[PDB]
Amino acid sequence: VSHQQGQSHLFECDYPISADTYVINWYKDGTSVMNYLSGGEPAFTEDLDDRTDVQFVNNRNLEITNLRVSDEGEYYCSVIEIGAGGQSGDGTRYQLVVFV
């Protein structure tokens, strides 16, 4: 995915969630930039901390409304299901390129 700074991007988590209770994290270059427990609220961390232009969309997807060059990197979601037969996995990885 390639964009100019100031554009927006929505990153899609394409991992199936069937459990009633589950956790979602968004990762940037292998570091968690957001965590969420089902029924709770998103907590943005590391590079996405203090960012007013980031949103957790439909309790799943990651929106960066005001892309910076520093937002460049690899992004993916990780899901952990809680309970019997609970599964765990990663969504598709996306390489974000941002130009001036």
Added chain:
Amino acid sequence: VSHQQGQSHLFECDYPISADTYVINWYKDGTSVMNYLSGGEPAFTEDLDDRTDVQFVNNRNLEITNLRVSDEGEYYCSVIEIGAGGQSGDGTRYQLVVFV
């Protein structure tokens, strides 16, 4: 770790957990064999499903009391912290050989 079948082994999750709300998973060869949400109960899955000799110890460690040859593989814990500044990471990877 190299053990004869019938021996026991305790796998240690050495990830520091300071957060109040968190999730612990144990992985075997990259596949989750147990999940746990703080305040909840462990759920054993995949190869550890329906094992009466497996236990979640002191709310973090993995005990297999009656090792089978099929139990061999690589094990590690993953922790996800929930909330502001929440981190996530893996414990040390352990390699288990079980022989007849």
